[PDB]
Design a protein around this nucleic acid. Structure first.
Ligand SMILES: [Ca+2]
Ligand code: NA
Ligand code: NA
Length: 276
DNA sequence: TCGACGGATCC
DNA sequence: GCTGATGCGC
DNA sequence: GGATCCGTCGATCGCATCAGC
């Protein structure tokens, strides 16, 4: 079945207006995504912060359009240390963060340009492109190691400031989170190990899945569709991109959106509204 | 993801 | 700059 | 022994690299 995201709710559970709008988008080739008019869509969405994953683009090759682009003038980029055209994330913000850092503090896990940490006044924002378990589950052993390091890192951070984690977490948590649960239990993104790691993440930090917390029984809501077999036109997809929040931020939570119609990637963008 | 192969196993 | 091949990805 | 089923097991799309010149 096809899916229609409900309208944006812009007041908090106590009627505070939303003050912060964060958008996150796995662009799967930043240059290609810009050629497919992604920035026009971003300009219209007008986020206060924009998080991009899988940029596949070194700092040298960042297209010129990205400077001419407030109110997202404070921009930060991370690329792998020795693997061109692979992975890569970015964070663009309207206001300058207090402090920015790259990676999680673990050399094993900080070589593929996957994590940017941006600290603001009232909270910390982490954006992440989690490593794929790979075809044939080749990288599943590595994925589990990543999962534990990432959880430990995020638990530490959240013990000091309220935390927002966004990005492509490369797992569909439960069977409502993808179209074909049956046929995918041994494929990357829906192995029992990856789903379990996501569950441990929610409990050990702790964090809440913003979208599921608000729409806990809404099926067919996905953020990814493989280019093959016209999957997107059939809405045969996966929910892989999330906003996870510290529990303390749940009374700030106004809405968590899925922008199903924005094209330019094999992921659509997601949008978080917070009253801060 | 999809169809195509298999190799079962029931009616 | 161009062809052709390989890496990666749910 | 012809028909539905059920664990594999290959060909798709898209991006960006590399090897070579
Ligand atoms: Ca590969
Ligand atoms: Na019968
Ligand atoms: Na016979």
């Amino acid at each position: 079945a096809l899916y229609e995201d409900p309208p944006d709710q812009k007041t908090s559970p106590s009627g505070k207006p939303a003050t912060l709008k964060i958008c996150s988008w796995n662009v799967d080739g930043l240059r290609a995504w810009i050629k497919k008019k992604g920035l026009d869509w971003v300009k219209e969405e007008a986020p206060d912060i924009l998080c991009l994953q899988e940029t596949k683009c070194s700092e040298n090759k960042l297209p010129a359009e990205l400077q001419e682009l407030p109110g997202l003038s404070h921009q930060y980029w991370s690329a792998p240390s020795d693997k061109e055209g692979y992975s890569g994330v970015g964070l663009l913000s309207r206001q300058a963060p207090l402090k920015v850092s790259y990676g999680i503090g673990d050399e094993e896990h900080d070589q593929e340009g996957r994590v940017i940490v941006a600290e603001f006044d009232s909270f910390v924002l982490v954006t992440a492109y989690v490593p794929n378990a790979g075809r044939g589950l080749v990288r599943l052993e590595y994925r589990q190691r990543w999962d534990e390091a990432f959880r430990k890192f995020l638990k530490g951070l959240a013990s000091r400031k309220p935390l927002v984690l966004c990005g492509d977490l490369n797992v569909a948590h439960e069977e409502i989170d993808l179209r074909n649960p049956k046929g995918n239990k041994k494929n990357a993104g829906f192995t029992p190990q990856e789903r379990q790691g996501f569950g441990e993440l929610l409990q050990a930090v702790p964090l809440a899945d913003s979208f599921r917390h608000l729409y806990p029984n809404t099926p067919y809501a996905y953020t990814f569709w493989t280019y093959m077999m016209n999957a997107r036109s059939k809405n045969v997809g996966w929910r892989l991109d999330y906003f996870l929040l510290s529990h303390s931020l749940l009374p700030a939570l106004c809405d968590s959106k899925i922008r199903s119609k924005a094209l330019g990637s094999d992921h659509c963008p997601i949008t978080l509204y917070l009253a801060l």
